[model samples]
Target chain A: HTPVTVIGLGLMGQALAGAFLGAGHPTTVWNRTAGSVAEAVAASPLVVVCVSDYDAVHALLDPLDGTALQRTLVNLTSGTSAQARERAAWADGRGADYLDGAILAGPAAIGTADAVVLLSGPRSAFDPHASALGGLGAGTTYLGADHGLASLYDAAGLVMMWSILNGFLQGAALLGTAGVDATTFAPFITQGIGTVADWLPGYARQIDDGAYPADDAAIDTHLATMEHLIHESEFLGVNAELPRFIKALADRAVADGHGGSGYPALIEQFRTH
Target chain B: RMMRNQQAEHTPVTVIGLGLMGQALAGAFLGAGHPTTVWNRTAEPLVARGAKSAGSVAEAVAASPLVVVCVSDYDAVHALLDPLDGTALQGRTLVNLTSGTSAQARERAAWADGRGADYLDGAILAGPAAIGTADAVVLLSGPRSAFDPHASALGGLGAGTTYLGADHGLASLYDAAGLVMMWSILNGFLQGAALLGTAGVDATTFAPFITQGIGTVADWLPGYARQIDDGAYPADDAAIDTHLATMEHLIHESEFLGVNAELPRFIKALADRAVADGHGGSGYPALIEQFRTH
Candidate 1:
């Protein structure tokens, strides 16, 4: 039943305000570039800020001069961990509770199951407002007290996006050379990707324990198959750089005496630099 | 049909090329109680393992209707089979498990057809040790009719002996494509691990998140693929520009952490190209256009 206000009426900002309003909460909005945050904050106890970046968030907050009080600052702007931590501290100095948040979904996904919003800050700050925050997205998670966790998680998720798609694109390119279209090759890649996903939990345990045992296939065996992939790519005139890059990593792991270890042993090579 | 199954269970198979994978193929057939005759430049060692030794490639070809060849390359396959006349190959099924390009597979398929042999090109996705187990994946492509009669016999090699269409090159193509998928995912994991390693996080710590993230991304592929196929990458999940922005962050993080920034930089270039092609507002699938030209 708490009143809410949204600052910055960009696409994401408008969606956030719309969700809060749609959920039947009293809501106020401000367009920082065109209007005032002072009026917006005075209208509600819970303030959500979604802006272009960290500098804009700071620009809007610096002029407030700590006059406004007793508000929870939930920042949904995309920024680095350091910036998130800095904003959290800045809000703390101004006597406002703070939670740094990263939206994993787009503007249209607000308030839906398709949206995943990650927030990290003091448990005290998040626990009380959990119910109201749940209105933003069904996949909301409160990542315990390091204000940087949200941004880190966001970055981690970014790593997944590029890697998976790059893999798909590489596969499609290789298969495309042979006249197999992307759609035909896609299901197999997805299924194989799912199969590879099953290996992560076990590999994670090996990475955590710092002892990689070749329970499935050894690094040496992967090296052999990698050779085949490289040969096939070069033989067919597809881009061989991706395979070469991974092979360099795999070859390094083997040279480091992990030839007998599982695929996760490559993590040792990753940690090398 | 049931009678063919009985004959298939007892059918004699001659495996040429006694390399590690070749031996595994012969061993799997032998384990399944088939009469397996193996031939190699040096066949004595493999023959000691319950397989009958054929002294010559012709004798090996004459020994069984099913001839499975796993060798160094397509050239080696030709070297071994060339001297043998059509009589040796006629009315026989030649399954080439050698690693080669689709062009090579197609060419060899034509050569096999010329010799009056039914050819099924294959690519093994599993290691030698995984042969005969559910872990092994052996893909075959040629005629479906040729695959049908020998499906039960081929099933003895691995649980995943799939039959692709009649292209003769699809198996090898899929094999290469599957490798692309594996390497891409693994490289991505390493990139992330290296990036996070700078922050005192081990590969193990970031792995579960990467795996879960992979699952979520995998769910997006079908829809994305549909978009790619339709040439309409609507901003369903996120825009290409959004991906481009995050990629910049990844590149920056990798560079700051002193990890290899090549992977992120490469991905960014592709996303940048897509943005340049007027797809900045489209979904992630819009990047496929760049991939196609590249």
Candidate 2:
């Protein structure tokens, strides 16, 4: 059996530790209340660390002798891409293979197919422990040897999650004024997003190619409807700022002469501050 | 193949305003074996496909019991249909697929009502080519009496065609709501792409992750909807304040990498309002209160 050591006793850590145990890997548990986190690191050749921040990640593993022991530290903590890279350097100085990771699910979702865990580091580091790591989730993915990618994606995911959630709330708020409960609006939104989601790959290609032909509707056509949504919000005594902001972004896009282009052409708006 | 087949598929219908969408509408109706009459400022393409060419908009209205309109705007809708004599629209169903505000949709409904016409406001959430596709959605709202009679005839438009409530404005309102959802999702993807691009991650590489993130959030919406309907957002998940903590990290991360943070900042500003409203301990759906007003 491939035994694994898990450092940290937080909710995420316990779920992770239990998943390893559930997957039939012998588990080592350590704490920050002051025990041998380093001894736990040395307990197994593969170590999984999920702690508060990069600072705490370093404070625990900073004293371990990974250069001699030849261990791999899969850091599942959340931090900036830059911070992840800096920590990668520290792990390298100790001759340890470091895999920076991010969890896209809550604690209860861990070890299930619904959870998505992403890791990025040297393939050499991940290959040996890939099957063992599969204990965390079915969607465990590896990005090419860039320690910063997992955290970068996690940060980016935060923006998307907040944007979608906030946008939904905005629509719910708008429809609420018309006596439409959010429940009634739910199925329509689910279908609405599928049609929009279908547009992404083509939009992604447009952003990469620097051309956006409006195969569906031009940005100008979209702007008119944006105006209608704003007016609807204001007329119904709901939040107008969101639709107003949406319009403001479109107005600037139109100002810069991308009105006839497709919605992906708005990527130029995000390309700047 | 008709999701709604209460009416005979052979019901006579007319499609006015021959844009790309209008042509798709007529093409589907003609292919589905409906006696389809087509009109525009012009029409020859669909006529070759077994569609009858009505010389004018009024004749188009007189040609069929069910008339579908999808032009560029509401003014075009009024300029074309409003000038018709009062008797032309009587006993006929006027379906306006043109995108506009709920007020305008209601206005058309009332205008039709005055002329003894049955009215149904329709919104096509798909493009021209997607008219009859299974996944394409065509939302119609008005009297069930008007919809049920022509239900199978409209089913030629899309399988997802279904009647919303009889509010008459629900179609347009739902259309705008869908717009908000689409914009929000795309804007978020662009922001995330910009953020990840800081580390030399191209969008194609980032696309899968962002899409997965989208799916993850979408799965949560159904439950979030429950909370909003219940009006009791117990923090079974992370509290708003906890979410606020990570939001600060996202804002700082974007700013540090020289990417745009306005969306992140706006996200926080909204959360900050919820906290001010004393919802710091509530779940994320509690922020619905802030969106309830300006």
Q: Using DockQ as the measure, which candidate wins?
A: 2
Candidate 1 runs further than 4 Å off? A22-24, A32-35, A107-109, A214-220, A251-261, B5-7, B17-24, B27-33, B39-58, B71-87, B110-116, B127-136, B197-205, B230-232, B235-237
- Chain A TM-score of each candidate structure, as shown: 0.94, 0.93
Model 1 Cα shift for residue B155 (angstroms)? 3.4
DockQ of each: 0.46, 0.69
| Top candidate by lDDT | 2
- Model 1, C-alpha of A125: deviation from truth (Å): 2.3
Candidate 2: tens digits of C-alpha lDDT, residues A1-273 = 698998887889989998999999888889866248766876799988898787788677666665544688889998888888898888888778889998888889889998789999999999999999998888888877999888888888888888888789888887776789998898889877766777787788888788899876789988888888989888888888878888988888899999999887887788786
> What share of the reference contacts survives in each candidate?
0.55, 0.72
lDDT (tens digit, per residue) of candidate 1 on B1-294: 457555645798999998888888888998887889988886465566678998799988999988999998888988999888877899999999998778888899999989999999999887799899998889999997778878888999888778888999888779877877887777677667666565566666667667767888887777766676676878864788867766787777666657677777888887888888888999877776665552
What DockQ does model 2 achieve? 0.69
Q: How far is A187's C-alpha from truth in model 1 (Å)?
A: 1.5
Kindly list the per-residue Cα lDDT of model 2 for residues B142-183, writing each as its tens digit: 998889888778888888888888988888888878888888
